[PDB]
Design a protein around this ligand. Structure first.
Ligand code: NA
Length: 330
């Protein structure tokens, strides 16, 4: 089997991407944030505290003939941005892009933090990191990908995120029409439960490539590219008037600037992030200070190849017995 679903930016900045997901019988379609940096499929629901729901579509298990309470199971998750959610668990039928899993754990939120309530466009998350990170207790649950894997034509999914445009998540196949040149594969460590890999270096603009190992995670649920402070300083030093602002919480730059590209290494291959991808617009409405899309990972404890980096590539998440990542230009 295979599945193929379109993923759409939630706003004009590509802050996140939503993908429609069918849950239950008859189908309830919710727009979920597919997150390769976490391992819970959780939704706004009929159980969510009413004051914490503001425009989201909810899952109502009582209206699904295939929903079953997973008795005694609870979940609670905290993300890198400080957001959180928690609740109880149902099993139900879940379909993505025509690919169906029966008996998927659907984590129903009883509580969500303010950042979730305030984002009316995101109805929940679908985690695509390794199932070792799943937070369900006392019986840990599998991701949608792990439950689908054995049925797929190939044990893979691909992320093809758009710049200010829709893109695609495919399950079970490589679309050889969706990228240019060849795919370069690189090793993955699953020791922290992430799609963790090592970039071979970077370049700023038309500058020389610096060969250096940068360990980090491929995380579709993170907006920006978070890299070591040395690398980030080298990038922003090429933008007149850019500075790190403790008040704003990262590097800012004059909205009048033209940003340089940023290149990262994947083995001997190179992915180029155009400068425009690194512009996250005014820090507040009408400001002439703009927020940068490359930020320091210092204090986060890991480097994160978030959407700024991933949307410059066609990315293969190879879930074979020995997982690997693949990157191609597009
Ligand atoms: Na922000």
């Amino acid at each position: 089997s295979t599945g193929s679903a379109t993923t759409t930016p939630i706003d004009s900045l590509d802050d996140a991407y939503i993908t429609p997901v069918q849950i239950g019988t008859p189908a309830q379609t919710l727009n979920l944030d597919f997150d390769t940096g976490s391992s819970d499929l959780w939704v706004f629901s009929s159980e969510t505290t009413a004051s914490e729901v503001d425009g989201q579509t909810i899952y109502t298990p009582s209206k699904s003939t295939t929903a079953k309470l997973l008795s005694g199971a609870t979940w609670s998750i905290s993300y890198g941005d400080g957001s959180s959610s928690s609740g109880d668990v149902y099993t139900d039928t879940v379909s993505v892009g025509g690919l169906t899993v029966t008996g998927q754990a659907v984590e129903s939120a009883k509580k969500v933090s303010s950042s979730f309530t305030e984002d009316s466009t995101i109805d929940g998350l679908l985690g695509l990191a390794f199932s070792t990170l799943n937070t369900v207790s006392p019986t840990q649950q599998k991701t949608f990908f792990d439950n689908a894997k054995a049925s797929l034509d190939s044990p893979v999914f691909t992320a093809d995120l758009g710049y200010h445009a829709p893109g695609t998540y495919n399950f079970g196949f490589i679309d050889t029409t969706a990228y240019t040149g060849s795919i370069t594969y690189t090793a993955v460590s699953t020791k922290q439960g992430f799609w963790e890999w090592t970039s071979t270096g970077y370049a700023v603009g038309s500058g020389t490539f610096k060969s250096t190992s940068i360990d980090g995670i491929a995380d579709t649920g993170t907006t920006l590219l978070y890299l070591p402070a040395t690398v980030v300083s080298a990038y922003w030093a090429q933008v007149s008037g850019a500075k790190s602002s403790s008040s704003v919480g990262g590097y800012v730059f004059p909205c009048s600037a033209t940003l340089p590209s940023f290149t990262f290494g994947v083995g001997s291959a190179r992915i180029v992030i155009p400068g425009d991808y690194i512009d996250f617009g005014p820090i507040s409405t009408g400001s002439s200070s703009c927020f940068g899309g490359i930020q320091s990972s210092a204090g986060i404890g890991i480097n994160i190849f978030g959407d700024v980096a991933l949307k410059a590539a066609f990315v293969v998440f190879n879930g074979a017995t020995t997982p690997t990542l693949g990157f191609a230009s597009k």
